[PDB]
C-alpha cells in the first residue's frame, strides 16, 4: 500500500503486488468459486525452487558481509518467505483433492502476500545497508572538514586538498547515482540541491583557507576574519552534508 521505495524494487515487486490484488478482487467477487483451479502443484513448485534460490543467496550474503544489522535483519525474511511456501504447497494439495476448496483460495492469497512481503523486506534490508555505506562516506568527509582548522601552511594545504577534492567526487558520484534511484521528487530534490550546494563551496573552502594560510604566514592583520569566513564555510558544508544523510534515511 505505500509507494515502493526505489525504482529498482518498484520494477521488481509492483507487477506482483498488482496481480495479487487482481486475485483478491477475483476471489471476493463471487467467483474463482466457479471452476477447477487446475492441479497447481507445478506452478507452486516453480515458486518453491525460486524462493529456495533466493534464500540460498540471502544466506550466502549473511555469512559474508561486515554489516551486523544485515546479519540480524535478513534471516526473518527467509522465514516469512519460507513459511509462505508452506501455505502455497498446502493450497495445492488442497486443490488436487478439491478444486472447489475454499480455504485453498485464502491460502493462495496469503502465500503470495507472504512472498511479496518477505522479498520486499529482504530487498529493503540490502538497500538499507546500501544506504549505510554512503552514509559512512559522508561522515568521512564530515570528519575531514574538521581537519581544515589546522591546515596552517602551503604544504598541508596541498596535501589537504589532494584528498578532499576526490573524497568529494566519490560522494558526488553516489549521491547522484542514488538520487536517480528514488521515488519521491522532494527527496530527489533535497539531495541534489544539498549536494550542488557543496560541489560549490568546495573551492570557497579552498580560497577561504588559502587566505588563512597566506595571512598567517605574513604575520598580519585580519587572520580573525579569514578564520571565520573559513569556519562558516565548513559550517555550511557540514550542515548540508548532515542534511543529505538525513534524506537518504527517509521512507
Amino acid at each position: 500500500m505505500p509507494v515502493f521505495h526505489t525504482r529498482t524494487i518498484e520494477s521488481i515487486l509492483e507487477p506482483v503486488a498488482q496481480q495479487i490484488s487482481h486475485l483478491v478482487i477475483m476471489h471476493e467477487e463471487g467467483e474463482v468459486d466457479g471452476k477447477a483451479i487446475p492441479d497447481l502443484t507445478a506452478p507452486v513448485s516453480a515458486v518453491q525452487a525460486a524462493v529456495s534460490n533466493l534464500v540460498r543467496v540471502g544466506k550466502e550474503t549473511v555469512q559474508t558481509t561486515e554489516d551486523q544489522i544485515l546479519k540480524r535483519d535478513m534471516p526473518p525474511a527467509f522465514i516469512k518467505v519460507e513459511n509462505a511456501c508452506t501455505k502455497l504447497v498446502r493450497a495445492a494439495q488442497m486443490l488436487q483433492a478439491d478444486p472447489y476448496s475454499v480455504p485453498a483460495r485464502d491460502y493462495l492469497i496469503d502465500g503470495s502476500r507472504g512472498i511479496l512481503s518477505g522479498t520486499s523486506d529482504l530487498l529493503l534490508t540490502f538497500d538499507e545497508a546500501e544506504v549505510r555505506k554512503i552514509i559512512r562516506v559522508c561522515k568521512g568527509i564530515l570528519e575531514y572538514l574538521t581537519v581544515a582548522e589546522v591546515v596552517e601552511t602551503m604544504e598541508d594545504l596541498v596535501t589537504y586538498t589532494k584528498n578532499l577534492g576526490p573524497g568529494m567526487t566519490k560522494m558526488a558520484k553516489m549521491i547522484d547515482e542514488r538520487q536517480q534511484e528514488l521515488t519521491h521528487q522532494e527527496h530527489r530534490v533535497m539531495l541534489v540541491n544539498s549536494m550542488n550546494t557543496v560541489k560549490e563551496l568546495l573551492p570557497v573552502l579552498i580560497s577561504a583557507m588559502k587566505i588563512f594560510v597566506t595571512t598567517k604566514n605574513t604575520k598580519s592583520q585580519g587572520i580573525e576574519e579569514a578564520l571565520k569566513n573559513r569556519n562558516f564555510t565548513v559550517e555550511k558544508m557540514s550542515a548540508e552534508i548532515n542534511e543529505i544523510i538525513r534524506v537518504l534515511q527517509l521512507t
Binding site: 486475485l23 525452487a49 524462493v51 543467496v57 502455497l88 540490502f126
Partner: peptide
C-alpha cells in the same frame, strides 16, 4: 548486489505465472 535482486525478480515471475495459471 544486483544478483540478490536478480533472484527476487525471479520469485516474482514464479508467483505471477502462478496467480496467472489459476484462471
Amino acid at each position: 548486489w544486483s544478483v540478490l535482486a536478480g533472484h527476487s525478480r525471479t520469485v516474482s515471475d514464479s508467483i505471477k505465472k502462478l496467480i496467472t495459471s489459476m484462471r
